Amino acid sequence: STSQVRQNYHQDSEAAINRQINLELYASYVYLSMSYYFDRDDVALKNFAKYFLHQSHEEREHAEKLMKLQNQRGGRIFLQDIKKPDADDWESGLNAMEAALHLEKNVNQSLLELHKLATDKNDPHLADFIETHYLIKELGC
Amino acid sequence: QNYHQDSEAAINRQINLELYASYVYLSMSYYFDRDDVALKNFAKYFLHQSHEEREHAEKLMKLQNQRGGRIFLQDIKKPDADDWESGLNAMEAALHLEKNVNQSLLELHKLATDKNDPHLADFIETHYLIKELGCHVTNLRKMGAPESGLAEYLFDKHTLGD
Amino acid sequence: QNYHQDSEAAINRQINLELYASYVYLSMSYYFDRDDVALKNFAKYFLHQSHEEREHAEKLMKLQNQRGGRIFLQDIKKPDADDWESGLNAMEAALHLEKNVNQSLLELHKLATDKNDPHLADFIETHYLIKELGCHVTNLRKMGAPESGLAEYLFDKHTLGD
Amino acid sequence: STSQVRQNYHQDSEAAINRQINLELYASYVYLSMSYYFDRDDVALKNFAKYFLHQSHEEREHAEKLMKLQNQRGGRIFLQDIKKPDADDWESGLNAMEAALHLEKNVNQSLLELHKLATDKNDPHLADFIETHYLIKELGC
Amino acid sequence: QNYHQDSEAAINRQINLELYASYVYLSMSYYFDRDDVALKNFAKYFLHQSHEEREHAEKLMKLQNQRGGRIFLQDIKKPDADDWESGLNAMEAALHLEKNVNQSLLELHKLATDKNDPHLADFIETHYLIKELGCHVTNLRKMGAPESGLAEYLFDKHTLGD
Amino acid sequence: QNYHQDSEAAINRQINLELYASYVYLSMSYYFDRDDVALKNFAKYFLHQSHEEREHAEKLMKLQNQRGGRIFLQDIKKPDADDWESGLNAMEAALHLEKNVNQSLLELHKLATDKNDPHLADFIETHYLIKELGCHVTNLRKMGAPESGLAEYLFDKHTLGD
Ligand SMILES: [Mg+2]
Ligand SMILES: [Mg+2]
Ligand SMILES: [Mg+2]
Ligand SMILES: [Mg+2]
Ligand SMILES: [Mg+2]
Ligand SMILES: [Mg+2]
Ligand SMILES: [Mg+2]
Description:
This is part of a larger assembly, with 6 copies of chain A.
Chain A: H1 11-37, H2 46-72, H3 94-120, H4 124-139
Helix pairs in contact in A: 1-2, 1-3, 3-4
One magnesium ion binds at residues 24, 59, 62, 107, 137 of chain A.
GO molecular function (chains A, D): ferric iron binding; ferrous iron binding; ferroxidase activity; identical protein binding; iron ion binding; iron ion sequestering activity
Family (chains A, D): Belongs to the ferritin family.
Protein name (chains A, D): Ferritin heavy chain
C-alpha cells in the first residue's frame, strides 16, 4: 500500500518525478549521441564532443538525484523505455546546438511545472529541492 | 563484402545491450535504496556496476567510430522488473543477464576475426563478473535467503562492505 | 495583523515539540542502558539524537528572539513509555514521533511565508531522519526483531557501531 | 541609394539584423530591470543582482557588435523604441529565471533563423558571424 | 505627505531621460561609423558618452532603491534622427539634448531638498558637458562646417584624437 | 565527380586574382613615389597591401598542394593604368578591384562546401579591407579631393601616417 516514511507527498508529485526521471535520462541519451557524432572523423570536433559528453554525464547524475528524492519521500520509482534520440547524423555542429536548446528548455520548463505543482500541494521540501536543482543547473559556471 | 556491415551491426547491438545492462543495475541499485528494502551495500554494488556497463558502451561507441562504422542507437528498454523482490533474486537476475550479454559479445568477437582483438579485453572481465555473481548467489542461498531477511542483512555487511 | 502572533505561537509550540522530542530520545537512550536491555549503540544513537533535538529547540529560541517575539515555555511532558520493549519498538516510536513533529514544523513554515526561509534548513533534515528511521525499522523487522534478540544484538553491532 | 561597400548583402538580412539589434537591446533592458529588483531590500539577493547586471551589459555589447556588422556591410541601422519590459516586480527569484529562459531562447532562436536566412542567400560572411556569435553566447563559460 | 512619491517619480523620470540620452549617443556613434560618414573619433566620442549616460541611469536606479522607492521603467524612445547629417549637427543636437535633460535634473534636486544632496555630483558634471559641447559646436562652425567636409575631418583628428 | 577539378580551377583562378591584385597595388605604390606625385604614406599603404595580397596567393598555393590539386599559373596581366591620377582615384580603384576579387572568392567558398572552411579566414578580412577603402574614399571626397591637392596631402599625413 503506502510507505512508512511518506508524508505530504502528493500522488501527483510522485508521478511528475517519475516523468522527470525519464526526461533527464532521455536528455543524457541525446547528449551522448551528439557527443560521439563529433567524435567521428567525418566531423572530428573534439571540443563539441567533450562538451556534450560532459552534459550527458550531468543529465544522468540529475536523474539519480531525482531517484534518490523519490525514495527519500516514500515515492516509488517506475522507469520507462529511454527512447532513441530522434537523429543519428546531427549534420552541422550548430544543428546540434539548436536541438540542445529545445531539449534544454523542455527539460527546464518541466522542472518549473514541477515547482508550480510543488507550491500548489504546499510541499516546501520538494519545492526547495527543485528550486536549488534548477539554479545550479543554470548558474553553476 | 558483408563483414563491415555485420561487424557494424554487432557493435551497434552490443552498444544497446551494455546500455540496457547499465539501466538494469541502475534500477536494481535504487530498489535497495527503498526505505522498505534498505540494503545500502546492495545499492552501492549495483550502482557501481551500472557505471561499469556504461563505460563499456562508450568504448564500443569509440570503437565503431575508429572502425569507420556508424553508430545507430535504439530505444533502451525498461528492465523486466520494478520490484526485484530480494537481494538473492537481484543477483540471480544479474547472473542471468550477464550470461546472455556475454553470449552475443562472443559472436561479435567470433565474427570480428580482428588483428587487434578489440573488445576481447572486456570479454575477459565478463567471465570474472559471472563467477562473482555465481559466488554471490551461492552464498546467499546457503545462508538462507531470500526468506531469511537476516541472511541478506549480514551479506550486505560482511561481503559487500569491502 | 494576526501573523506576528501566529508566527510567535507556532515557534512557541515548535520549541516545546523539539524539547519533548529531546526528552523522548533521552528516555529511550537510558532504556538501552539498562542491565536487562544492554544495547550500548542503541543507547548512543538515541542520546546523540537527543542532543540534536535540543540544539534545534535553542535555534527556535534564538529565532523567536530575532523576530522580536516572546518565548513562552510550557511543561515538557513525560514520554508515553518508561519501558520501550525492544529496539524495533523504540525505532517505530521515533519514526512515529518524528513524522508528527515534522507535520507541525511544516505549518510553521507554511504560515511563515518568510523572506529568509528560517527553519527550512532544519525542516530539510527531518526528512533525512525519517528515511533513516524507516531504513532502521525495516532492517530490524526483516532480521526478525523484536522477538529475535539476536537480530537486535547484531544490528546494534553492525549498523549502529559506525 | 546604395552603399559603395555593399556586396552580397540581401535586403532581407539587413532587416533581420535591424530587428536583432532591437531584440538584444530589449534583452539588455529586461536584465537591467531584473538586476535592480534583486537590489532592493525587499529582496536583497546580491548574487542574482550581480548575475543579471552582467547579462545586461553583455546583451548590450552584442547589440553593438550587430551594429558594427551592419555598417561593415553597407547596411543601414534603423533603431526602434526599446520597449518597457513586461514587469516591474519579478516577484520570486525563480520567476525571474523563468522569464529569462523564454527571453534567452527567443533571442537565440532569432539568431538561428538569421543563420538560416544567411545560408539561404549564400552569405558565408554573415553565416559565419552569427554562428561564432551564437556559440560564444552559449559555450563561453 | 506627497514628497516621497514626487521624489520617486522624478527619479523614475530621470532614469528614463538618461537612458534615452545613452540611446541617442549610441545612435550618433554608429552614424559616424557609416562608410559614407567615416569619422572614427566622432564615433568614439559619442560611444564613450553613451556609456557615461548609462552609468548615471544605474546610479539613479541604485539611488531610488536606497530611498526605499520603486523603480518604474518605461519605453526608451527612438531618437529623433537616424541620419545625423553632419558632425556639427550631431553636436548641436547633443547640446540641445543635454540642456533639457539638465533642466529636469534640476527640478529633481530642486524638490529633493535632501540632506545628502544626492545626484548633485552628477548635476555638476552636466554643466561641464554643456560648455564642452558648446566649445565643440563653436569650433566646427568657425572652421566652416558643416559644408566643409575638411573642417570636420580635421576636427576629428585634432580635437577628438586625444 | 567534377568537384575536385572545379575546386582545383577556382583556386587556380583565385591564385591569379590575388597575384594580379598584388601587381595593382605595387603599381599604385610607386605612382605615389613619383617626384610629381609625392605622397609617401600613400606609397607605404599600397606597398604594404601589395605584400598582403601576395601572402594570400601563396596560401592558396599551399592550399591547392594539400588538396592534392595541381597549380596552373597564368600570365599576371598589367593593371589598367600607369597613371593613377590622384589619391582618391587610386582608392576608388582599389575598392572596385577588391570587391570583384571578393566576389569570385565567394564562389570558391560557395562551391568548396569544405569541412575545414579553408580560405574563409581570408574571405573575412576582404570585408574589413572593403569597409576601410570605403572610409578612405569617403574622407578624401568630403575633404575636397581630388582637385584639392591639400586634401590628399593632409590625408596622407593624418590618416595614413599611423
Ligand atoms: Mg538535468
Ligand atoms: Mg544556458
Ligand atoms: Mg557487459
Ligand atoms: Mg525535530
Ligand atoms: Mg545577446
Ligand atoms: Mg545626463
Ligand atoms: Mg584579396
